[PDB]
Design a binder for these strands. Structure first.
Length: 146
RNA sequence: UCCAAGGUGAACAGCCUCUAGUUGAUAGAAGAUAAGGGAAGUCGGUCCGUAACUUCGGGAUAAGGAUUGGCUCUAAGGGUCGGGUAG
């Protein structure tokens, strides 16, 4: 959006727009920016929306400006879906009890916020300094505010 | 045919006054109420006590007396500088 708003860039010859994860880009948060981005670009074009949950963005696909569209749905136990019901104050401990006991090559642990990612990363590193968990595990943190 | 102050009224009205005009018109003296009866008459009888609310802007970001720190992704968030031990 910042790039297209610069006067040095002309958008008149564009003839192809693709939105990957189009259900996420038409979300309530992203709709403000994508509306402007599509506003700058010419209306007569070919649009391709691609998303693994494209059905959820039900009537918001026409906000993109489809002209001659064809919806496409592709369908096929690959993986296990479990859940644990525990007291919150134990939750982090349970995480540790999974990291040093389960068998894996890569484990991805999701956190709600970025500050939580940094804070718990530092505390788990401190625990590993004291050898609370003993394994050939290398721990990284990656949030989107970096 | 032109000009046209204010206050009360808190209902055009009426009342009072500011500026400005008058003191003109022979002079002196000496409708209302009603006891009892009630048509017997005549042709004809706005202010005291409650409660909720309630005006303009600026603010964005969950609050606004408290210990303020407040979501995920996504353009920019003042400038600059700086990293070990050895040969």
């Amino acid at each position: 959006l910042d790039f297209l708003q610069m006067p040095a860039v002309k958008t008149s010859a564009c003839s192809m727009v693709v939105m990957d994860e189009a259900d996420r880009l038409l979300d309530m948060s992203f709709i403000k920016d994508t509306e402007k981005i599509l506003r700058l670009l010419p209306k007569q074009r070919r649009t391709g929306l691609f998303s693994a949950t494209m059905r959820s963005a039900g009537s918001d696909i026409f906000k993109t400006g489809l002209r001659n569209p064809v919806r496409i749905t592709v369908n096929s136990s690959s993986l296990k879906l479990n859940y644990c019901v525990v007291n919150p104050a134990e939750k982090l401990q349970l995480l540790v009890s999974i990291l040093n006991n389960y068998k894996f090559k890569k484990c991805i642990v999701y956190f709600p916020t970025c500050v939580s990612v940094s804070y718990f990363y530092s505390f788990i590193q401190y625990l590993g300094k004291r050898n609370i968990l003993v394994n050939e595990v290398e721990i990284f943190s990656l949030h989107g505010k970096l």
